[PDB]
């Protein structure tokens, strides 16, 4: 054999993950989609025990 | 070898797998039950005033 040109090793090919990131669904993401609705309704409930 | 490297669990090595949940109702529960009671708390005073 001749002097090695092309030198190499073993590396690690992963799915190369972007920047997947959305819009109005990313702001309700923390609490829940579903807390906000009762939480809602405990607000309108409320002002109807004020009224 | 026969107990760490043969077993099937990598315990004490993961850690924290960023615990993606957003937020359970069981923390929000028992202040709906309180705001509940306020409430009905509330309504009870002022019709006996």
């Known amino acids: ?51 | 070898k026969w107990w760490y490297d043969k077993g099937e669990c990598g315990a004490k090595d993961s850690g924290s797998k960023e615990k993606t949940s957003a937020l359970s109702l069981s923390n929000v529960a028992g202040v709906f039950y309180i705001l509940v009671g306020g409430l009905g708390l509330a309504m009870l005073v002022a019709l006996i005033e």
């Open chain 1, 1 to 51: 054999f001749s002097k090695p040109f092309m030198s190499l090793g073993i590396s690690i090919m992963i799915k190369k993950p972007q920047k997947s990131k959305p819009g109005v669904f990313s702001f309700l993401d923390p609490l829940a989609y579903e807390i906000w609705m009762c939480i809602v309704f405990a607000y309108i409930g409320v002002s109807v025990v004020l009224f």
